[PDB]
Design an enzyme around this catalytic site. Structure first.
Site, PDB file in Angstrom:
ATOM      1  N   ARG A 113     -20.014 -17.268  11.698  1.00  8.15           N
ATOM      2  CA  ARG A 113     -20.419 -16.433  10.538  1.00  8.15           C
ATOM      3  C   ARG A 113     -21.138 -15.186  11.058  1.00  8.15           C
ATOM      4  O   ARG A 113     -22.091 -15.336  11.839  1.00  8.15           O
ATOM      5  CB  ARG A 113     -21.339 -17.263   9.638  1.00  8.15           C
ATOM      6  CG  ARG A 113     -21.945 -16.513   8.464  1.00  8.15           C
ATOM      7  CD  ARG A 113     -22.493 -17.526   7.487  1.00  8.15           C
ATOM      8  NE  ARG A 113     -23.307 -16.926   6.448  1.00  8.15           N
ATOM      9  CZ  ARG A 113     -23.648 -17.524   5.316  1.00  8.15           C
ATOM     10  NH1 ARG A 113     -23.234 -18.752   5.055  1.00  8.15           N
ATOM     11  NH2 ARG A 113     -24.382 -16.873   4.430  1.00  8.15           N
ATOM     12  N   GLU A 143     -24.200 -19.517  11.077  1.00  8.83           N
ATOM     13  CA  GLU A 143     -23.427 -20.774  11.014  1.00  8.83           C
ATOM     14  C   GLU A 143     -22.187 -20.625  11.903  1.00  8.83           C
ATOM     15  O   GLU A 143     -21.495 -19.608  11.782  1.00  8.83           O
ATOM     16  CB  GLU A 143     -23.081 -21.048   9.558  1.00  8.83           C
ATOM     17  CG  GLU A 143     -24.318 -21.217   8.687  1.00  8.83           C
ATOM     18  CD  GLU A 143     -23.991 -21.281   7.214  1.00  8.83           C
ATOM     19  OE1 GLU A 143     -22.872 -20.902   6.871  1.00  8.83           O
ATOM     20  OE2 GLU A 143     -24.842 -21.736   6.432  1.00  8.83           O
ATOM     21  N   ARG A 154     -16.361 -16.063  -2.886  1.00  2.00           N
ATOM     22  CA  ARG A 154     -15.999 -17.371  -2.290  1.00  2.00           C
ATOM     23  C   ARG A 154     -14.935 -18.019  -3.172  1.00  2.00           C
ATOM     24  O   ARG A 154     -15.266 -18.579  -4.221  1.00  2.00           O
ATOM     25  CB  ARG A 154     -17.267 -18.191  -2.054  1.00  2.00           C
ATOM     26  CG  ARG A 154     -18.165 -17.519  -1.030  1.00  2.00           C
ATOM     27  CD  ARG A 154     -19.285 -18.404  -0.591  1.00  2.00           C
ATOM     28  NE  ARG A 154     -20.241 -17.690   0.230  1.00  2.00           N
ATOM     29  CZ  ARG A 154     -21.417 -18.193   0.577  1.00  2.00           C
ATOM     30  NH1 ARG A 154     -21.775 -19.398   0.159  1.00  2.00           N
ATOM     31  NH2 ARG A 154     -22.236 -17.483   1.325  1.00  2.00           N
TER      32      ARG A 154
END
Lengths: 519, 519
Positions: free
Chosen positions: B390, B374, B454
């Site tokens: 990424r 990504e 995250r």
């Protein structure tokens, strides 16, 4: 030109819109190939009257990495989707054809062009909601036509399919899940099934959990709406999520028809598992509490809970609770509930708790075996209790005898040998010779018949006090994956009832003729 | 004894009934102790008129094994419960008090007797549904009274709390979940947010997934009902579960105001992940397809999908798809979408795809970097594209430059150093000096600002074309756990919008003054 057919040994639910009758794998399709028609036949003796409809579904193809021996890409009919447990997920299966008047021969058609390689079809059977629980279907795919040529059919598809009823589905009455079945038959022939109502999710105590009860006065064809048999709401101003009660065990006092339900009330303990977080002491703030309710009106209404912790829990134990499932009345009228405790060193032990005074006072003596948990007890012969135990060593059930209500214990010959398990709850009951159509004392046992996972839910019968469990005296009910807990109760002289966590519903009832067990 | 207070840096949702303002741990309570009253103070310039109510909740105690440093036993307000994402789960929190007229000083009361040891309370704020997204609360617990004695207060609670809006909550319009945000601002100032509509669950393609779109003509205060921008239903007679489309990327053609959405359509592949199951080839049956829709009416209606696969996919690639989030118009009017491909040896590469003809034809040249996925692209200087990637190596974003639309690539000074990550989607945008109130070129970047998990969703600004990201030029929006994907778009000259997966909602919108970033 080659087609594979599976007839899965899983319950056909009379209350379901869809049930998997056949799964079909067409492994080596050319792009554009069409399954023009397939023919099913039902056996001569099948009661086709109570079949409401048969459907042919297409489910597309398989993932390149998942290999060529599967019968489906996905679960067709979910037992967990709170929004739909009763019909095929329409996003996984597209209806090709449907017949709503069923004859002994039946043809279903598609005009769906297949993709290159693996293609999945399946056949759904829908039963009349008043279908007999004792009805059976003997169904075969006899013809599959592809590009107007009959294709070669392979696979084991000669299973005799049985009926069942989803007493509780995921999402029913707002509850995420239902777990931990118990079943008794009252002196009035009334079936009483108990379970955890796990409102938020499916995790064990501590959580928002009540004890539910389903009642049937017609041998399981219909079930009265769920009653809450025990609940602690916001006791002491702690959230309901820190006031769960569950892991129920039910017994009928056969002398009085007084029904008793014992359960573990966890008070506090954050949002963690009670198994590792219940601690030594006696107060509700300190340790899990042993709670009991009773019904004097054949399970219609339930007493407020009595706290029996002080009578039977050693202060040094981290955790005392009932063995989930059921207890018994002995021939001398002693009430017996299996129990389990975690000792001061976090070692679990199975044992028994009994009342000699109609359930007024309870006593626990000595544990049966180290590193056992969930157990069920049967009076295999007068004054002789057989404790059948979940064993953390794996592979097989532990079996011990007491003749003195657990003061002393003897290893049974069948111990850690005769009954395979994967470390899971199992049901054991005794049936007196005069109380059943065989006219012989029986032991009946149910569990996932495997040393790995939870599948192949099987009823086994013994004629020799559980010394031997002959393969012939066994019926496979559910060969697919579930949570595996089960509980047996004789419905009448001729039939045994099983209330269990199945691949088709969180609480599944089936009725089996003991003449199917012992032929 | 002392009490601990947390003011969590998470969004206060204007559309929520409950939001966590404070969590309170009373670690060493004596059984029967009562939190008589608690005083909060708001800053003098706080707009307390758009605070609808403040609530004090009790959540009971902690599990014995979970230790003493947590601020809660459980998530109070769920972002996943399809039955309730907007109010506190009533099974985990019991309301003690509520004030519906909020002053600079505010007192909340309980009469709840505490248990021995850890006790949890928390403060919920409800905002007026029309609350300004740019509004802030500066709130502090100034007094906690237990047994009519003021208690010693400890903890970092000096957070300046920001507002947001839950554009999509789990369960909205029957969808289990929403994932993979993209955001643009049209030439009319209209916010367009795109996302996966993941109907059955939250797993990646292949599954029943459509591309949803939320539209706002008032800078995110209100959002029009969800539109389906792209969907493949039962294409070719395959189930919708084997016809998912998702991982959307959106861009505005700034010359025409034509809006474009690119997405990956997976056809077949059973119920497995496309990332490992998409295979070499070109046809929908063989490999994931690159699909595009357009809106010529400011995102109100969407074209049928066009299949772009043949123009840009090498046959030997296992998988070609867009980088999720957004694409750009360059100053010379070139449209650019970040892309990613898995090569014949299953090695992923990030790159760019561009149109020089208003989106008629698309081209891909060379990948930027091995083992990236990504990426997001910004035109940092005229004709100079920065690809921010990424990186499967972990720890930090890869950063490359192309001046020839990806024919050749140069490592940027900031590469694998300046921007920490946990291997997760990140947003990067460029803002020209003349287009913003600072009068200086900006790069703005958002991701979970951590190398693990995250959490700590953060907007970072750079004044030197992404050579440096100074700590002071950063705003923390969400310090709690989420799925971590985000997308930035300038709302106007003064404010940047972020559309992201947060701890408080699957699709969360917040607006931030760039004068908060660059002080």
């Amino acid at each position: 030109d080659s087609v594979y057919v599976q007839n899965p040994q899983i319950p056909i639910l009379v209350d379901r819109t869809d049930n998997v009758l056949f799964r079909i794998r067409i492994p080596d399709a050319t792009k554009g190939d069409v399954l023009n028609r397939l023919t099913i036949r039902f056996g001569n003796e099948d009661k086709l009257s109570e079949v409401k409809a048969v459907r042919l579904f297409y489910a597309g193809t398989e993932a390149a990495t998942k290999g060529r021996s599967r019968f489906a890409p996905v679960t067709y009919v979910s037992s967990h989707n709170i929004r739909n447990t009763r019909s095929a997920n329409p996003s996984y299966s597209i209806r090709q054809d449907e017949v709503t008047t069923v004859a002994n021969t039946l043809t279903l058609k598609t005009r769906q062009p297949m993709v290159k390689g693996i293609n999945y079809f399946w056949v759904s059977v829908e039963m009349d909601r008043n279908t007999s629980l004792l009805s059976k279907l003997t169904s075969t795919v006899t013809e599959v036509v592809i590009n107007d040529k009959p294709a070669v059919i392979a696979g084991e598809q000669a299973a005799v399919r049985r009926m069942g009823i989803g007493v509780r589905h995921a999402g029913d009455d707002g509850s995420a899940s239902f777990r931990i079945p118990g079943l008794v038959t009252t002196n009035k022939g009334t079936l009483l099934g108990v379970y955890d109502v796990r409102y938020n999710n499916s995790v064990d105590l501590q959580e928002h959990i009540d004890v539910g009860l389903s009642r049937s006065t017609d041998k399981g064809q219909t079930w009265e709406p769920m009653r809450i048999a025990m609940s602690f709401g916001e006791t002491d101003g702690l959230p309901s999520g820190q006031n769960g009660v569950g892991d129920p065990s039910i017994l009928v006092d056969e002398r009085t028809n007084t029904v008793w339900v014992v359960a573990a009330w966890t008070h506090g303990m954050g949002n963690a598992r009670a198994w590792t977080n219940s601690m030594p002491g006696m107060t509700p703030d300190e340790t899990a509490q042993l709670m009991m309710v009773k019904s004097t009106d054949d399970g219609r209404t339930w007493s407020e809970s009595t706290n029996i912790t002080s009578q039977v829990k050693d202060p040094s134990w981290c955790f005392l609770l009932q063995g989930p499932g059921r207890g018994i009345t002995m021939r001398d009228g002693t009430l017996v509930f299996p129990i389990q405790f975690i000792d001061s060193l976090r070692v679990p032990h199975a044992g028994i708790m009994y009342s000699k005074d109609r359930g007024e006072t309870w006593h626990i003596h000595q544990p049966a075996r180290t590193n056992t948990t969930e157990a069920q007890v049967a009076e295999v012969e007068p004054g002789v209790l057989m404790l059948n135990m979940r064993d953390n060593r794996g592979g097989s059930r532990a079996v011990s005898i007491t003749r003195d209500l657990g003061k002393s214990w003897t290893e049974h010959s069948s111990n850690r040998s005769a009954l395979p398990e994967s470390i899971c709850m199992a049901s054991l009951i005794s049936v007196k010779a005069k109380d059943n159509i065989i006219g012989k004392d029986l032991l009946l046992f149910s569990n996932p018949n495997t040393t790995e996972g939870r599948h192949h839910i099987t009823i086994k019968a013994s004629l020799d006090g559980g010394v031997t469990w002959l393969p012939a005296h066994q019926v496979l009910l559910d060969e697919e994956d579930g949570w595996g807990y089960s509980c047996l109760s004789m419905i009448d002289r001729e039939t045994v009832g099983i209330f269990y966590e199945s691949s088709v519903a969180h609480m599944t009832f089936q009725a089996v003729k003991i003449k199917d067990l012992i032929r």
